[PDB]
Amino acid sequence: LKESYLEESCSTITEGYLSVLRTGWYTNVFTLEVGDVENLTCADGPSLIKTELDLTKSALRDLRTVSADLGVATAAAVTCGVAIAKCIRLESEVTAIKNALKKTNEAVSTLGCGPRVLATAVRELKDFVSKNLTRAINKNKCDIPDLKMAVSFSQFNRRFLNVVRQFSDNAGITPAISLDLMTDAELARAVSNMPTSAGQIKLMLENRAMVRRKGFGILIGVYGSSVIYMVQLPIFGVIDTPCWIVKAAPSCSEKKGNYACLLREDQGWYCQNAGSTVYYPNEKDCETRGDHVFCDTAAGINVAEQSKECNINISTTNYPCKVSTGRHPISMVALSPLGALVACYKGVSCSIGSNRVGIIKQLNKGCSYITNQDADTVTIDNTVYCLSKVEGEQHVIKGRPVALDQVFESIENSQA
Amino acid sequence: LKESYLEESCSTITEGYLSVLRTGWYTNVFTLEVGDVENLTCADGPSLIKTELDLTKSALRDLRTVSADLGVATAAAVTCGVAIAKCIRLESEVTAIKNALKKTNEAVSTLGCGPRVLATAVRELKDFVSKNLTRAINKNKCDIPDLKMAVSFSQFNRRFLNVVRQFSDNAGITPAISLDLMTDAELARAVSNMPTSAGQIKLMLENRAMVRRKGFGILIGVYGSSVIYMVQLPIFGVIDTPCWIVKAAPSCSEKKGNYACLLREDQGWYCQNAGSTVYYPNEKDCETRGDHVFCDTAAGINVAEQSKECNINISTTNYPCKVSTGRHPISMVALSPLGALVACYKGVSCSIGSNRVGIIKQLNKGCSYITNQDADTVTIDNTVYCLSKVEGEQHVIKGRPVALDQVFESIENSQA
Amino acid sequence: LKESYLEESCSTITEGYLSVLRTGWYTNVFTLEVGDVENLTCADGPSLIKTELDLTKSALRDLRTVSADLGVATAAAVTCGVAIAKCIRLESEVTAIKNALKKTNEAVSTLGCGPRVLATAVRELKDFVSKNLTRAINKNKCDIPDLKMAVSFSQFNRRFLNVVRQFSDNAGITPAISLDLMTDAELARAVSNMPTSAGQIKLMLENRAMVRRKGFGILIGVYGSSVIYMVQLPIFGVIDTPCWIVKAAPSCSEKKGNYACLLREDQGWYCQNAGSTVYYPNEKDCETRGDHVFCDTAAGINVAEQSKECNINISTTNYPCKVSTGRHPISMVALSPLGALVACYKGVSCSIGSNRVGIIKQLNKGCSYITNQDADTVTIDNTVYCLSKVEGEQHVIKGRPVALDQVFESIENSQA
C-alpha cells in the first residue's frame, strides 16, 4: 500500500501484497440424471412434447457422438485433468460412486486414484422423466391436452441442453465454469469442501468468481441414463505472503538531435514463496483484487533473491540486470498503481488533466512521474489515459537516471 | 483506389482511404427494471411459475454475488471504462438519474463527472412483474390454471437471464455488444446521440456492426429492484483523412546455390491525423470496409513524415528504414489489395489459376507481382491462395530490386 | 508408436503417425425457410404470439442490418470463403439453386463458379409459418386461446434465433460449426458427400468433431423469406503418410558456478507429403487423436529432407541446424509422448511420483529422461506435471550431450 518511484531509473515498485496462490486442483464431479428417456417414444404423430423428446434425444445422442482420445501453468494443469478423466472410467469407479451417490445428493469419496474427490448429484431430470412425465408418456401418447407437461419438460431439460451446447461447442474442455455448469450453491459447496486452512477457503469463497475464472471443465462421458462431467477448481492453498510488482518506462537521453535509450525488461510480478522469489512475467499469470493478488504459481519461475540489488546499486550490482538497448527515438506511458511514468519526447505532446480543474499543465519532455492524487487523467496526443483515485503513500528515491551487465560489457569491450 | 507496385523493392502500396478514426468513447447506460420481485414467493408447492421465480431470483442473487474490485488502445480505453463505473455509484448518481429516468424511457444528463451521458430505460419486466404478474401471485398461489402467465414470465425474463449469462460468464466486461445487451433500435438511439459532426454519426450508423465490435460492456451493479449496466461505444470522431497501407515480400538473391535475403519491416497501416503520420503496425488496430478504414487511433504511433523517402531513394534516404536480414532460403506469398507478391524459390512450386480458364502458367522463381485482374487464384504447392476481383488502377515503378541503414552500416564497418 | 530418446542431445523423437491432412474445403450451403412472415401482424393488442412475432421480425430485421464489405493456413482459407460468398449472389445463383431445392431437401449442384457444391434445405419454419400458424394468424388475431400455437412458434424459431445470435454476435464468420448451425445428421450428410477416397471420408466421419473444429461459417444473406448461410468444412484429402514429432529440452553445462547453455529450435511437427517434408512449427497447426494426426497442410513449410542428419551427426551435419544460445542459468520440463525431459538445475527441486508407490526419488541435477512407465507424475517445486500411462517401445541413443553452424562459426571466428 506504499509505492516507491525510482528517480534513478524512471521506474516504479508497488509493495504491500497478499498472495492468493494457486497451488492445487479440486475436482468436483457432477452426475446429472437424465433418466431412462431413450425407451420413451411419441407415436401420436408430430407433437410439441414429441419435438422436445426428439430434441432431447438428439442432443443426448449428439453428446454420445463426442469423443477426445500455453503459458506453462495451464498445460501442466491439463495433464492433471486428463489424469482424472482417465482414472474415472477406471475400475468402473462409476459403478462405485454410483452406488455411493444413490444414498445422497452430495458426498466425499476416495476414487481409485482420487484422494477423496467430491461427488454431487443432480437427479431432477430423471425423477421428472421417470415419475410425472413418464406416466403421462405411457401408451405412446404425446398430444395430450396437458400443455403444462410440455413446459415443465423444456424448462427441466434446458439445463441439460445448454450443458450440451457448452460441451459440444467447446470440443469437451470449457476454459471456465458457467452458472449453468455449476450453480452458485453447488459452486459454494464444492469450494467449501477444499483441503486447506480456514483463511484460504474463506477468502476463496469471497471472490468465488476468480475460482470460476481459474477453473475449467472436462467432459467425462454419457453412460445409459447418466450424464457425467468434472470441474477443476483451483485451490489457492497459499495466501498472505509478500508479493510486489515492478514497472518501468524508457530512459532516453538526447544529444545533438540523436537519442540513446535503454529499458529494464524485468517488469511483472514477484512473490516470496517457500524460500524463493517467483517471477510471473506475464500479466495473466497473476490478477489483482484490491490489496490481494491471485497468481497461478505453476506459472512462475524461481529466480535468485538478487532483485533487490537491481534497486540499490543497479550498474554495479552482482547479478546482471537484464536490459535491452536502442538507437532511434520512441515515446509512451506505462501506467502505475499510484500514477504513471510518462516518457514524452519530441514528436508527441503529453498533458495531465483533472476531472475537477481541467487540463492542469502540459507535461515535460523527458521522464516524468505523475501521482494519481496529482491528476485524474493523462493524454498523449489523441490517445487518452485516465487514472484511478486510489490512496496510499508514494516515495521518490533521488538519483540521476541481454543482461544490463552485457551492455556494460559490450561498450567496455569495444573501446580498449 | 490506385495501387503502386514498387518493382525496386518487391513491395506494394495501396492509396485512397478515408479514415474512420476512433477518437473517443460514448457511454450508454441502461437501466433494466426487474421489479419488486424478491418479496414474491410461491408457497403452493412446486410449480412452473415457482420454478421460474426461483430461477429468476437465483440468477438475480447470483448476479448480486458478482464483484470486481493488450495492444495499447484497449488498455487506455479500459481505464476510461473503470472511471465511469466509479463516478456512477458516486454521490449515488443512481438516485439522481433514477429521478431523471422515471419521467421518460430515454434521456440525456450530465453525470457527477459525466459530461452529459446517455440513459436508457427498459422497464417492461418491472411493470409486468408489478401489474399483471404480481396481482396473480398475490396470496402465494402459483399453480394457477393460467398457463399464459408462466409463458409471459419466461419470455420477459429471458432478456434478463441471457443478460445474466452474458455478465456472469465473462467476469463483468464483455468485449462487444450483443443484440441482447442493446437491441438495434436502442443501439441506434445511442449511436445517434454521439457528439461529432454529421458525416461521422451518419457513417458510424451505416456500419453500426463496427460500433458493436469496437465497443464493450461494463457491469455497474444491482440495487434493489434495478439492474444497471453501461456500454462503451467508440466515437469515430474523425473521418475522411488520407490513409494508405504498406505490404512487402522477401527480396532474395542467389549465388552458387546460396541465398542472401532481406525484408522491410514497415508493413501495416499509416494515417494523416493532426499533422503527423500514425502507424498501426498490427492488422487489428485498423479494419477495412470497402474504401473506408476503421482504426482505433490510440493504437497508433506518431512517426516522422519521412516514410515517403523509403519509396523514392530507400538506400540513400535520411531516416533509416528498418529492415531485417537473413542467411538461409525461404518462400511465401503476401497477398495485396489488387494482387499478390509471390516469392517462389527452389523447393516450392507456385502457380496462378483462373476460375474461367484454369491454371494459366506456373509462376517464376524469383519475385513476381500478380494482379487480381490477372488471376483468380494463386497456389504454392498444396497451400491454396485465392484472390479478389476488385477494380482500380495498378502501376509498376521500375527499378532493380534493425534500421536498414544499420545493415549498410554493419557491412560497411566490417570491410575497412 | 516407437519413441527415441537422443541421449546425445537431451531430446526426443516420436514416430509412427498417420496423416490426416487438410488439403481442401467443402462447402455446405444451408437454406432456412422462414416464410412469408413479414406480411403477418398482430393487431389484437399486446400478445404472447405478438411478442414472438415482433421478436422474430426484430431478429430477422436485425440480421438484415448486417453487412460485411493469422497462422497462414486460415488466411488463405478465408480468401476461399470470401470467394464463395461472392460467386453465390452472382448470376443470382440463388434463383437457380432455389429452383433446384424446391424439388428436394438435399441435393448436389455445380455453382456458377462452384464445382458442384452441396445444398441442404431446412423449410420447417416456413411450412409451419405458412400452414398451421398463418391460418391461425389470419384476421390479425393473436390472443387466441390456443396456447399450443405460441409454444410451437418459440420452439421452431429458436433454431433461427440462436442462428441469429450466432451470426450477429460474431460479425458474420463463426470460427466453428455449432450443433445449431448444422446438426449431426446434416453434418454427416455433408461430410459424407466430400470428394476423396473411401478411407478419408470414413475416417473424417469418425472424428467429425474435428471436422466441426476445423471448419467455419459464413453469412451469405437474407432475401425475402429465405435465410442463407454456408459452412466451410475441411477436406482431409490426405491420410496415412509418415509424420513424426520433435521435442527438445535445454542442454546446460556448469563450470565454476557459471553456465553455458544451448537449445534446439526445431521443435514441432514434420510430415512426408508429395516428396517434401512439411514443418508445422506451432502446435495448433496439427492435433493428435490417438495414433492419427490432424494437420492443416497450408500451415506447413517445405523444408529440405536434411533433418535426419540433425540426429546422426548434428555438429558436423551439412544443413545448419538452427539453435539458440545463452549465458545465465534456467530450469524446466518439456513433457514428451512417453515421458519428460527434465532439466533440473541449482535453484529448483524436481521429483517423480507414483500414483501407486508415492514419490519414488528426487530427480538429478542435469538432464534426465523419464518414461511414462517409470512415473505417473513429475514435480518441479510446487509446479505439478503429471504424466500419461500410454504403451509403446522407447529407446536411448548413447552419446555425450541462428543456425547451430552459425554458433560454431561465431566461436571459431572469434578465436583466430
mmCIF file of N, CA, C and O in Angstrom, chain B residues 147-148 151-152 155-156 158 162 165-166 178-179 183-184 206-210 213 283 289-290 327-329 335 347-348 355 381-388, chain C residues 22-23 48 51-52 59 62 65 67-70 72 76-77 79-80 83 86 147 158 164-165 169 171 273 276 297-298 300 302 319-320 322 402-403 406 409:
data_model
loop_
_atom_site.group_PDB
_atom_site.id
_atom_site.type_symbol
_atom_site.label_atom_id
_atom_site.label_comp_id
_atom_site.label_asym_id
_atom_site.label_seq_id
_atom_site.Cartn_x
_atom_site.Cartn_y
_atom_site.Cartn_z
ATOM 1 N N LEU B 147 -51.858 -20.787 -17.685
ATOM 2 C CA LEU B 147 -50.560 -21.156 -18.176
ATOM 3 C C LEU B 147 -49.936 -20.019 -18.962
ATOM 4 O O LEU B 147 -48.707 -19.877 -18.946
ATOM 5 N N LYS B 148 -50.765 -19.123 -19.511
ATOM 6 C CA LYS B 148 -50.295 -17.889 -20.152
ATOM 7 C C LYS B 148 -49.383 -17.054 -19.255
ATOM 8 O O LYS B 148 -48.406 -16.448 -19.725
ATOM 9 N N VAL B 151 -45.768 -18.480 -19.363
ATOM 10 C CA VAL B 151 -45.044 -18.240 -20.612
ATOM 11 C C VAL B 151 -44.660 -16.776 -20.797
ATOM 12 O O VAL B 151 -43.530 -16.468 -21.224
ATOM 13 N N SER B 152 -45.527 -15.846 -20.397
ATOM 14 C CA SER B 152 -45.090 -14.457 -20.458
ATOM 15 C C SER B 152 -43.897 -14.239 -19.539
ATOM 16 O O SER B 152 -42.938 -13.555 -19.909
ATOM 17 N N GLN B 155 -40.555 -15.569 -21.074
ATOM 18 C CA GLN B 155 -40.157 -14.760 -22.221
ATOM 19 C C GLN B 155 -39.610 -13.417 -21.796
ATOM 20 O O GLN B 155 -38.681 -12.888 -22.426
ATOM 21 N N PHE B 156 -40.228 -12.820 -20.771
ATOM 22 C CA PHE B 156 -39.865 -11.471 -20.376
ATOM 23 C C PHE B 156 -38.593 -11.478 -19.533
ATOM 24 O O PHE B 156 -37.764 -10.559 -19.636
ATOM 25 N N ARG B 158 -36.318 -13.666 -20.057
ATOM 26 C CA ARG B 158 -35.276 -14.264 -20.889
ATOM 27 C C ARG B 158 -34.236 -13.200 -21.180
ATOM 28 O O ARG B 158 -33.033 -13.487 -21.200
ATOM 29 N N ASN B 162 -30.428 -14.038 -20.132
ATOM 30 C CA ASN B 162 -29.299 -14.089 -21.039
ATOM 31 C C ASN B 162 -28.382 -12.932 -20.670
ATOM 32 O O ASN B 162 -27.171 -13.056 -20.766
ATOM 33 N N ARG B 165 -26.427 -14.347 -18.053
ATOM 34 C CA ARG B 165 -25.435 -15.269 -18.607
ATOM 35 C C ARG B 165 -24.267 -14.460 -19.140
ATOM 36 O O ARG B 165 -23.105 -14.812 -18.927
ATOM 37 N N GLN B 166 -24.566 -13.384 -19.879
ATOM 38 C CA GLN B 166 -23.516 -12.613 -20.536
ATOM 39 C C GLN B 166 -22.656 -11.897 -19.495
ATOM 40 O O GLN B 166 -21.487 -11.605 -19.760
ATOM 41 N N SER B 178 -23.849 -7.509 -27.544
ATOM 42 C CA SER B 178 -24.721 -8.418 -28.277
ATOM 43 C C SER B 178 -26.052 -7.709 -28.556
ATOM 44 O O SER B 178 -26.307 -6.606 -28.064
ATOM 45 N N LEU B 179 -26.906 -8.350 -29.371
ATOM 46 C CA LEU B 179 -28.242 -7.826 -29.685
ATOM 47 C C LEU B 179 -29.176 -7.965 -28.497
ATOM 48 O O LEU B 179 -30.306 -7.457 -28.537
ATOM 49 N N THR B 183 -30.599 -3.648 -28.182
ATOM 50 C CA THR B 183 -31.105 -4.028 -29.474
ATOM 51 C C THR B 183 -30.679 -2.974 -30.453
ATOM 52 O O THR B 183 -30.086 -1.951 -30.102
ATOM 53 N N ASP B 184 -30.988 -3.246 -31.701
ATOM 54 C CA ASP B 184 -30.637 -2.306 -32.744
ATOM 55 C C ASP B 184 -31.321 -0.954 -32.574
ATOM 56 O O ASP B 184 -30.687 0.066 -32.831
ATOM 57 N N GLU B 206 -24.314 3.770 -40.387
ATOM 58 C CA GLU B 206 -24.347 2.807 -41.521
ATOM 59 C C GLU B 206 -23.828 1.443 -41.058
ATOM 60 O O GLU B 206 -24.559 0.444 -41.191
ATOM 61 N N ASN B 207 -22.601 1.429 -40.538
ATOM 62 C CA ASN B 207 -21.797 0.246 -40.299
ATOM 63 C C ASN B 207 -21.810 0.017 -38.830
ATOM 64 O O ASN B 207 -20.779 -0.095 -38.168
ATOM 65 N N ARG B 208 -23.016 0.002 -38.287
ATOM 66 C CA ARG B 208 -23.108 0.019 -36.853
ATOM 67 C C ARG B 208 -22.663 -1.286 -36.265
ATOM 68 O O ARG B 208 -22.524 -1.369 -35.040
ATOM 69 N N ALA B 209 -22.495 -2.311 -37.097
ATOM 70 C CA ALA B 209 -21.907 -3.544 -36.597
ATOM 71 C C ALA B 209 -20.444 -3.323 -36.144
ATOM 72 O O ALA B 209 -19.989 -3.994 -35.203
ATOM 73 N N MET B 210 -19.710 -2.349 -36.748
ATOM 74 C CA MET B 210 -18.360 -1.993 -36.272
ATOM 75 C C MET B 210 -18.402 -1.224 -34.968
ATOM 76 O O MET B 210 -17.506 -1.362 -34.128
ATOM 77 N N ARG B 213 -18.687 -4.009 -32.634
ATOM 78 C CA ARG B 213 -17.466 -4.794 -32.432
ATOM 79 C C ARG B 213 -16.396 -4.048 -31.649
ATOM 80 O O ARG B 213 -15.710 -4.645 -30.806
ATOM 81 N N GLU B 283 -2.625 -5.672 -37.625
ATOM 82 C CA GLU B 283 -3.729 -5.559 -38.543
ATOM 83 C C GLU B 283 -4.905 -5.026 -37.731
ATOM 84 O O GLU B 283 -5.422 -3.943 -38.021
ATOM 85 N N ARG B 289 -13.487 -1.404 -44.617
ATOM 86 C CA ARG B 289 -14.836 -1.682 -45.089
ATOM 87 C C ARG B 289 -15.025 -1.007 -46.460
ATOM 88 O O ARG B 289 -15.329 0.198 -46.521
ATOM 89 N N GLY B 290 -14.665 -1.703 -47.547
ATOM 90 C CA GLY B 290 -14.735 -1.012 -48.836
ATOM 91 C C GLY B 290 -13.625 0.014 -48.931
ATOM 92 O O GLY B 290 -12.452 -0.321 -48.779
ATOM 93 N N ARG B 327 20.359 -15.181 -43.852
ATOM 94 C CA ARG B 327 21.289 -16.149 -44.448
ATOM 95 C C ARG B 327 20.826 -17.547 -44.985
ATOM 96 O O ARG B 327 21.678 -18.262 -45.527
ATOM 97 N N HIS B 328 19.544 -17.956 -44.945
ATOM 98 C CA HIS B 328 19.115 -19.356 -45.385
ATOM 99 C C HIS B 328 17.843 -19.167 -46.199
ATOM 100 O O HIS B 328 17.072 -18.262 -45.870
ATOM 101 N N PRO B 329 17.568 -19.935 -47.261
ATOM 102 C CA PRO B 329 16.424 -19.546 -48.109
ATOM 103 C C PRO B 329 15.042 -19.913 -47.526
ATOM 104 O O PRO B 329 14.863 -20.971 -46.909
ATOM 105 N N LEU B 335 -0.367 -11.674 -49.855
ATOM 106 C CA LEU B 335 -1.453 -11.169 -50.673
ATOM 107 C C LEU B 335 -1.591 -9.652 -50.444
ATOM 108 O O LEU B 335 -1.374 -9.168 -49.324
ATOM 109 N N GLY B 347 12.509 -25.313 -54.319
ATOM 110 C CA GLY B 347 11.948 -26.143 -53.277
ATOM 111 C C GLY B 347 10.439 -26.091 -53.251
ATOM 112 O O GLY B 347 9.810 -26.937 -52.592
ATOM 113 N N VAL B 348 9.841 -25.057 -53.856
ATOM 114 C CA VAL B 348 8.395 -24.959 -53.902
ATOM 115 C C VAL B 348 8.003 -24.684 -55.349
ATOM 116 O O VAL B 348 8.799 -24.180 -56.148
ATOM 117 N N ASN B 355 -10.563 -19.075 -62.538
ATOM 118 C CA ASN B 355 -11.851 -19.680 -62.349
ATOM 119 C C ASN B 355 -12.531 -19.848 -63.715
ATOM 120 O O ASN B 355 -13.446 -20.668 -63.848
ATOM 121 N N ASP B 381 2.540 -24.967 -53.891
ATOM 122 C CA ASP B 381 2.329 -26.397 -53.596
ATOM 123 C C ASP B 381 0.865 -26.753 -53.404
ATOM 124 O O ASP B 381 0.067 -26.669 -54.343
ATOM 125 N N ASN B 382 0.519 -27.194 -52.192
ATOM 126 C CA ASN B 382 -0.851 -27.538 -51.844
ATOM 127 C C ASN B 382 -1.567 -26.421 -51.082
ATOM 128 O O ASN B 382 -2.775 -26.530 -50.815
ATOM 129 N N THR B 383 -0.844 -25.371 -50.692
ATOM 130 C CA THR B 383 -1.451 -24.252 -49.995
ATOM 131 C C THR B 383 -2.175 -23.436 -51.066
ATOM 132 O O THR B 383 -1.534 -22.970 -52.019
ATOM 133 N N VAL B 384 -3.490 -23.298 -50.970
ATOM 134 C CA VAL B 384 -4.237 -22.563 -51.989
ATOM 135 C C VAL B 384 -4.424 -21.118 -51.512
ATOM 136 O O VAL B 384 -4.849 -20.904 -50.372
ATOM 137 N N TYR B 385 -4.152 -20.117 -52.375
ATOM 138 C CA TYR B 385 -4.461 -18.710 -52.071
ATOM 139 C C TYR B 385 -5.392 -18.159 -53.111
ATOM 140 O O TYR B 385 -4.923 -17.752 -54.172
ATOM 141 N N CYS B 386 -6.665 -18.025 -52.855
ATOM 142 C CA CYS B 386 -7.349 -17.387 -53.966
ATOM 143 C C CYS B 386 -7.254 -15.867 -53.834
ATOM 144 O O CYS B 386 -6.638 -15.337 -52.901
ATOM 145 N N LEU B 387 -7.867 -15.171 -54.807
ATOM 146 C CA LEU B 387 -7.809 -13.713 -54.953
ATOM 147 C C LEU B 387 -9.172 -13.116 -55.290
ATOM 148 O O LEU B 387 -10.036 -13.763 -55.890
ATOM 149 N N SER B 388 -9.312 -11.834 -54.939
ATOM 150 C CA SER B 388 -10.452 -10.978 -55.255
ATOM 151 C C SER B 388 -10.452 -10.538 -56.716
ATOM 152 O O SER B 388 -9.489 -10.755 -57.454
ATOM 153 N N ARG C 22 -5.440 -31.604 -43.974
ATOM 154 C CA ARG C 22 -6.389 -30.723 -44.612
ATOM 155 C C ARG C 22 -5.794 -30.235 -45.894
ATOM 156 O O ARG C 22 -4.850 -29.448 -45.875
ATOM 157 N N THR C 23 -6.365 -30.692 -47.007
ATOM 158 C CA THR C 23 -5.916 -30.328 -48.345
ATOM 159 C C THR C 23 -6.953 -29.459 -49.063
ATOM 160 O O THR C 23 -6.572 -28.700 -49.963
ATOM 161 N N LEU C 48 -48.679 -12.729 -26.372
ATOM 162 C CA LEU C 48 -47.514 -13.620 -26.413
ATOM 163 C C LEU C 48 -47.151 -13.989 -27.848
ATOM 164 O O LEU C 48 -45.975 -13.986 -28.221
ATOM 165 N N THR C 51 -45.714 -10.855 -29.215
ATOM 166 C CA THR C 51 -44.352 -10.620 -28.766
ATOM 167 C C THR C 51 -43.389 -11.542 -29.523
ATOM 168 O O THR C 51 -42.315 -11.098 -29.932
ATOM 169 N N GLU C 52 -43.756 -12.831 -29.726
ATOM 170 C CA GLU C 52 -42.906 -13.750 -30.505
ATOM 171 C C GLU C 52 -42.797 -13.336 -31.963
ATOM 172 O O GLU C 52 -41.730 -13.458 -32.575
ATOM 173 N N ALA C 59 -35.432 -9.902 -34.866
ATOM 174 C CA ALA C 59 -34.176 -10.617 -35.099
ATOM 175 C C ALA C 59 -33.894 -10.720 -36.591
ATOM 176 O O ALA C 59 -32.747 -10.595 -37.031
ATOM 177 N N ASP C 62 -32.872 -7.282 -37.723
ATOM 178 C CA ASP C 62 -31.529 -7.087 -37.211
ATOM 179 C C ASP C 62 -30.517 -7.857 -38.065
ATOM 180 O O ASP C 62 -29.450 -7.321 -38.381
ATOM 181 N N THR C 65 -29.813 -5.854 -41.156
ATOM 182 C CA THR C 65 -28.918 -4.756 -40.830
ATOM 183 C C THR C 65 -27.529 -5.281 -40.591
ATOM 184 O O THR C 65 -26.754 -4.697 -39.826
ATOM 185 N N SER C 67 -24.029 -6.372 -42.494
ATOM 186 C CA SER C 67 -23.225 -6.333 -43.707
ATOM 187 C C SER C 67 -21.722 -6.210 -43.461
ATOM 188 O O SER C 67 -21.283 -5.386 -42.648
ATOM 189 N N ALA C 68 -20.955 -7.029 -44.197
ATOM 190 C CA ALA C 68 -19.501 -7.088 -44.240
ATOM 191 C C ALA C 68 -19.266 -6.291 -45.536
ATOM 192 O O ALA C 68 -20.234 -5.767 -46.094
ATOM 193 N N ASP C 69 -18.046 -6.202 -46.074
ATOM 194 C CA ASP C 69 -17.953 -5.486 -47.392
ATOM 195 C C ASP C 69 -17.334 -6.292 -48.564
ATOM 196 O O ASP C 69 -16.115 -6.369 -48.741
ATOM 197 N N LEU C 70 -2.967 -14.691 -39.885
ATOM 198 C CA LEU C 70 -3.364 -15.443 -38.683
ATOM 199 C C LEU C 70 -2.901 -16.952 -38.802
ATOM 200 O O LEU C 70 -3.704 -17.848 -39.083
ATOM 201 N N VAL C 72 -1.131 -18.345 -41.036
ATOM 202 C CA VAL C 72 -1.115 -18.517 -42.506
ATOM 203 C C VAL C 72 -2.219 -19.373 -43.187
ATOM 204 O O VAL C 72 -2.867 -18.892 -44.132
ATOM 205 N N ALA C 76 -5.338 -17.961 -45.984
ATOM 206 C CA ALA C 76 -5.561 -18.380 -47.359
ATOM 207 C C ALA C 76 -6.958 -18.993 -47.475
ATOM 208 O O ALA C 76 -7.694 -18.755 -48.453
ATOM 209 N N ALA C 77 -7.356 -19.731 -46.424
ATOM 210 C CA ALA C 77 -8.669 -20.382 -46.353
ATOM 211 C C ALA C 77 -9.815 -19.357 -46.374
ATOM 212 O O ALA C 77 -10.875 -19.588 -46.979
ATOM 213 N N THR C 79 -9.666 -16.408 -47.712
ATOM 214 C CA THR C 79 -9.814 -15.892 -49.057
ATOM 215 C C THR C 79 -10.698 -16.855 -49.877
ATOM 216 O O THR C 79 -11.621 -16.402 -50.579
ATOM 217 N N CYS C 80 -10.535 -18.186 -49.701
ATOM 218 C CA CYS C 80 -11.537 -19.116 -50.277
ATOM 219 C C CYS C 80 -12.967 -18.738 -49.895
ATOM 220 O O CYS C 80 -13.839 -18.557 -50.755
ATOM 221 N N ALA C 83 -14.489 -16.017 -51.557
ATOM 222 C CA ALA C 83 -14.709 -16.255 -52.958
ATOM 223 C C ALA C 83 -16.065 -16.925 -53.108
ATOM 224 O O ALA C 83 -16.856 -16.584 -54.002
ATOM 225 N N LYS C 86 -19.121 -14.581 -52.598
ATOM 226 C CA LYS C 86 -19.250 -13.725 -53.772
ATOM 227 C C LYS C 86 -19.954 -14.446 -54.900
ATOM 228 O O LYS C 86 -21.050 -14.053 -55.346
ATOM 229 N N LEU C 147 -52.908 -21.868 -26.748
ATOM 230 C CA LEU C 147 -51.593 -21.594 -26.237
ATOM 231 C C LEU C 147 -50.562 -22.496 -26.890
ATOM 232 O O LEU C 147 -49.414 -22.070 -27.066
ATOM 233 N N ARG C 158 -36.648 -20.946 -32.458
ATOM 234 C CA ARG C 158 -35.483 -20.943 -31.575
ATOM 235 C C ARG C 158 -34.257 -21.252 -32.413
ATOM 236 O O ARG C 158 -33.186 -20.673 -32.194
ATOM 237 N N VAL C 164 -29.422 -16.557 -35.363
ATOM 238 C CA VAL C 164 -29.241 -15.119 -35.451
ATOM 239 C C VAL C 164 -28.262 -14.653 -34.389
ATOM 240 O O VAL C 164 -27.404 -13.816 -34.664
ATOM 241 N N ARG C 165 -28.359 -15.191 -33.163
ATOM 242 C CA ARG C 165 -27.389 -14.840 -32.125
ATOM 243 C C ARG C 165 -25.998 -15.179 -32.628
ATOM 244 O O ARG C 165 -25.059 -14.399 -32.461
ATOM 245 N N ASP C 169 -23.625 -11.985 -33.170
ATOM 246 C CA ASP C 169 -22.600 -11.889 -32.127
ATOM 247 C C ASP C 169 -21.169 -12.003 -32.685
ATOM 248 O O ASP C 169 -20.245 -11.402 -32.122
ATOM 249 N N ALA C 171 -20.009 -11.129 -35.903
ATOM 250 C CA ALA C 171 -19.770 -10.243 -37.050
ATOM 251 C C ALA C 171 -19.598 -11.028 -38.363
ATOM 252 O O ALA C 171 -18.841 -10.641 -39.259
ATOM 253 N N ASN C 273 4.789 -35.344 -47.262
ATOM 254 C CA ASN C 273 3.741 -35.152 -48.235
ATOM 255 C C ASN C 273 4.333 -34.757 -49.580
ATOM 256 O O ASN C 273 5.218 -33.890 -49.654
ATOM 257 N N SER C 276 8.225 -33.958 -50.206
ATOM 258 C CA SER C 276 8.843 -32.960 -49.369
ATOM 259 C C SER C 276 8.428 -33.187 -47.916
ATOM 260 O O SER C 276 7.482 -33.939 -47.614
ATOM 261 N N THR C 297 -2.537 -28.570 -43.773
ATOM 262 C CA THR C 297 -1.277 -28.531 -44.534
ATOM 263 C C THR C 297 -0.848 -27.158 -45.031
ATOM 264 O O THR C 297 0.357 -26.890 -45.113
ATOM 265 N N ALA C 298 -1.792 -26.266 -45.332
ATOM 266 C CA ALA C 298 -1.397 -24.944 -45.808
ATOM 267 C C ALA C 298 -0.659 -24.176 -44.746
ATOM 268 O O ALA C 298 -0.088 -23.123 -45.055
ATOM 269 N N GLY C 300 1.961 -25.487 -43.153
ATOM 270 C CA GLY C 300 3.283 -26.050 -43.037
ATOM 271 C C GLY C 300 4.223 -25.358 -44.038
ATOM 272 O O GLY C 300 3.797 -24.640 -44.948
ATOM 273 N N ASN C 302 7.658 -26.230 -46.694
ATOM 274 C CA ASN C 302 8.580 -27.188 -47.318
ATOM 275 C C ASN C 302 10.004 -26.897 -46.886
ATOM 276 O O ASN C 302 10.628 -25.909 -47.288
ATOM 277 N N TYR C 319 23.291 -29.503 -43.508
ATOM 278 C CA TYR C 319 22.420 -28.322 -43.385
ATOM 279 C C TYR C 319 22.635 -27.755 -41.971
ATOM 280 O O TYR C 319 22.722 -28.529 -41.009
ATOM 281 N N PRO C 320 22.740 -26.397 -41.788
ATOM 282 C CA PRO C 320 22.920 -25.867 -40.421
ATOM 283 C C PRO C 320 21.675 -25.903 -39.527
ATOM 284 O O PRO C 320 20.728 -25.123 -39.714
ATOM 285 N N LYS C 322 19.245 -25.179 -36.730
ATOM 286 C CA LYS C 322 19.096 -23.859 -36.143
ATOM 287 C C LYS C 322 19.076 -24.038 -34.630
ATOM 288 O O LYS C 322 18.487 -25.000 -34.129
ATOM 289 N N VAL C 402 19.424 -18.433 -34.809
ATOM 290 C CA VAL C 402 20.559 -18.600 -35.705
ATOM 291 C C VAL C 402 20.791 -20.097 -35.880
ATOM 292 O O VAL C 402 20.361 -20.919 -35.064
ATOM 293 N N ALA C 403 21.347 -20.454 -37.032
ATOM 294 C CA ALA C 403 21.765 -21.823 -37.304
ATOM 295 C C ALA C 403 22.871 -22.275 -36.350
ATOM 296 O O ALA C 403 23.745 -21.482 -35.994
ATOM 297 N N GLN C 406 26.023 -21.517 -37.269
ATOM 298 C CA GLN C 406 26.416 -20.123 -37.058
ATOM 299 C C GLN C 406 26.970 -19.882 -35.657
ATOM 300 O O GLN C 406 27.701 -18.909 -35.452
ATOM 301 N N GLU C 409 30.411 -21.277 -36.146
ATOM 302 C CA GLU C 409 31.078 -20.250 -36.942
ATOM 303 C C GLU C 409 31.436 -19.007 -36.112
ATOM 304 O O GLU C 409 32.515 -18.436 -36.297
#
